[PDB]
Symmetry: C3
Subunit: 320 residues, 3 copies
Amino acid sequence: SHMKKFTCVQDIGDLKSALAESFEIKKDRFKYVELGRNKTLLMIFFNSSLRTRLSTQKAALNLGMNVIVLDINQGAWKLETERGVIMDGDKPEHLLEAIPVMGCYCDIIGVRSFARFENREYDYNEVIINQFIQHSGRPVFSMEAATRHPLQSFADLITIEEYKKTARPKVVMTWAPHPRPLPQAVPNSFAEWMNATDYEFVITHPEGYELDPKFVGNARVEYDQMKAFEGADFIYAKNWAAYLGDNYGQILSTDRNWTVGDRQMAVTNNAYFMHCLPVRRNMIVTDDVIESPQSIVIPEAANREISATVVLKRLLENLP
Amino acid sequence: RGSHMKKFTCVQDIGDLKSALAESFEIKKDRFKYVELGRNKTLLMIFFNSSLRTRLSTQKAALNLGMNVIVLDINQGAWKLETERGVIMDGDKPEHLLEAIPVMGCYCDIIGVRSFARFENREYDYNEVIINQFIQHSGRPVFSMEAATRHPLQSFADLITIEEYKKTARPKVVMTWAPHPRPLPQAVPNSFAEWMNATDYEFVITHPEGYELDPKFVGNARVEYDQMKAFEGADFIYAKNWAAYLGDNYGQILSTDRNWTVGDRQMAVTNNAYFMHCLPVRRNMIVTDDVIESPQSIVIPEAANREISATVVLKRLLENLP
Amino acid sequence: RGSHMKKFTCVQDIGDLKSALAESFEIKKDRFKYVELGRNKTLLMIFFNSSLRTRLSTQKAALNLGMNVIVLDINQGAWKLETERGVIMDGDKPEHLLEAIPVMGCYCDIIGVRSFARFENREYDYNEVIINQFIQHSGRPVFSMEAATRHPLQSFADLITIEEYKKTARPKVVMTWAPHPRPLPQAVPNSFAEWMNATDYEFVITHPEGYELDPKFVGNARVEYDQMKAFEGADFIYAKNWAAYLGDNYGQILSTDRNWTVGDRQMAVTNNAYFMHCLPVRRNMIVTDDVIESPQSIVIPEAANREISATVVLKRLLENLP
Ligand SMILES: CCC[C@H](NC(=O)CCC(=O)O)C(=O)O
Ligand SMILES: CCC[C@H](NC(=O)CCC(=O)O)C(=O)O
Ligand SMILES: CCC[C@H](NC(=O)CCC(=O)O)C(=O)O
């Protein structure tokens, strides 16, 4: 109703009407194509992106909006994040001017800023995405911040609601091996959203990979993957670098027994396989599992356009 | 057949050249006549390689039809893609082509893909594996922005331009090889041969020994190893370099013999022939500064038609969307 | 002029400043008043160098008028261009500016170009070769997004903002140099001077010894080598760095004297002068964290005006298209 931003599941409000708007748009994609007329959306990327990048633009177009995609670093000037420093080097511009400026030429702003893993507090305080909310002078929405990825999660919800065979399915989020250290933003956001639902949500990961409590909530945590997978209805695999104190942003394991393969899927209740994507085949999941019919990885991606369209619509409706 | 365009990768896709030409000139005359046809329709242009002409003329084409445009440079703004299936993705690539293709198809209505020959495996390039995967798994109509072995958008523009300047019904069009510093794909030459072979033009291909093109593209086109003989009485000169193709020289430079550089020497022997080149062009390599700057050079009006060929193709595709 | 705009590279192109500012504030008031003027008209924005403000603001401006927009980053998505004629293109560059320019002109209606001075040859930069070749060969109206020696879109933005906040009819506007770690083009300064010199303002330029600008730009503007003196009783402080321009020091850094860094010390001596800067600004080099964050700083409302200057220029250009 009165959406001023979109960085967490709280901003979307009641999940019932949110899911209603979602399926309404899936049914009539351009129904609100006149809503965003003469409204401009500025998409800012500090990181790579295929899905968010494409689906958000399609989403804005579904609402008749103008779209400006800006890849800082590539086309603009490197930004100085720390205040008070003497800008006599690498950075030609300071985030403190850049943010307000960018806000001068748009109506809504989308920002993607991966966790830098330099300082756990700096990341978890979502300093950057917050400065955009504080000084852009425009409604801001996350395209993945340091600790959350609402647009993705919202999409994960829509798709599960879409394929679930029972009213309260067992949804198991599972960790998987990866060669590089990834943020825990996707995992945090998933947990955050599944917890807002009535699903039988379970989190499984190797020892040492506990996520932030404020995110895990009262979700059951199982250190045995095969157990957690038992009778699952949906498997949401995703890797994430450590989080606890002395290991923040670190790779503690690359154990390939966690790679979601047929073995683990067999113990499930013919569960569907999900994943936000990008996905490293034969690392996170076997070719067979991802290529199998229980894999709804694509319908999942498709819904990204919907979550984004719905969010964008709400944001527009609340514009002055 | 032209009213049933499901894709656009070769000359067969365009159907009757007569009507295809008719539309081309209709649109040259009235650029935004169909600006309402693709309203709320979205085009996704995907580049795996650099581009100026295709990049710019396709977007303009899309806009002439009122479409929405999204240009994506994989590698630059996205994640590197793994092209081989079955491999363990424990390295350089975060995403696999198998997921990327379908994903991309989710957010648009029509897809345009540019993927140059990689020259790593001839079969891989000539079976057009990549471009075909986009066709098989994208879920959308796909048009080539230059694949490994063809470049229909260009050749279509070439046909339009030749039909636009030709002084006779069946001119002598000579495609000539030229020296180049790097190994280039035989896509433009192939596609040119294919389109010209589809016309009633007197088509001749001239290149040094060792640079013969795939027979399926050469067709029954006369092949002349004496550049000066080929140029005689020509009405159009289509210069373009391409790396070797046969046997052990696939994707190799056999020579950089500057005797083939198109200079006033060869042009003189022609019937005051027009000079054409798809661009980019390395001056004083492929063609002399004098020739390319000469009034017979229609290099630009040629490039300009790239907008027309793309508009007609996109229009056909729109008309055949579900 | 102004009513017959065929380009926009310098202040003469805008014409009568009075009506120019009239349109500027008309648009600030009603941003999409002419959203139908540029329908089906396409704008091509070319970038040879980085940009945040021109890049963003120009697109917004175009969208205000309902135009189609294509942003192109040569080097990134296109092929590297050969700027010199007559060379044998057998290396780094696959395309020559001589084809590229005309080609780019084929797919749009209006062209915006950004080409920073290269500091390789003073005459080459001040003759504004590149920006002029676009004007000669694009076959389209060309507006500057910052050439080697001017940046009209910025200075027109500055004029709009100074007129927007000035407290008297003819304020004292001082443009002051400032230290920087790298050599920058004198485009912004030149351009600022040029626009100020066309106003009834009291214009003063202050910089270290050795940093005198091109006389053609300086005009009859007062040049004070004592920063503190110049700042005395100022109404506006327009800080900006620039590398040497005179003889043997073209494109060089003669000084990094931090006493010139605009701080509270200098602002103190002004008449509660506003602080301005085109941006990007290196904090604690050009200006103090405090001065820029101070309430006298109108750096952002200034930047916001970039959208207006570009919307007015684009509008005039549209109104003068065939
Ligand atoms: C609009 C100003 C553009 C430019 N500034 C830079 O190139 C600054 C880059 C740096 O600070 O290193 C200049 O001085 O002309
Ligand atoms: C939407 C997912 C984005 C990201 N994943 C990656 O960046 C994976 C990159 C890699 O595989 O190297 C993450 O975990 O947040
Ligand atoms: C439209 C032509 C595209 C490409 N050309 C190049 O890759 C030229 C590169 C160079 O000149 O270095 C080719 O030959 O297929």
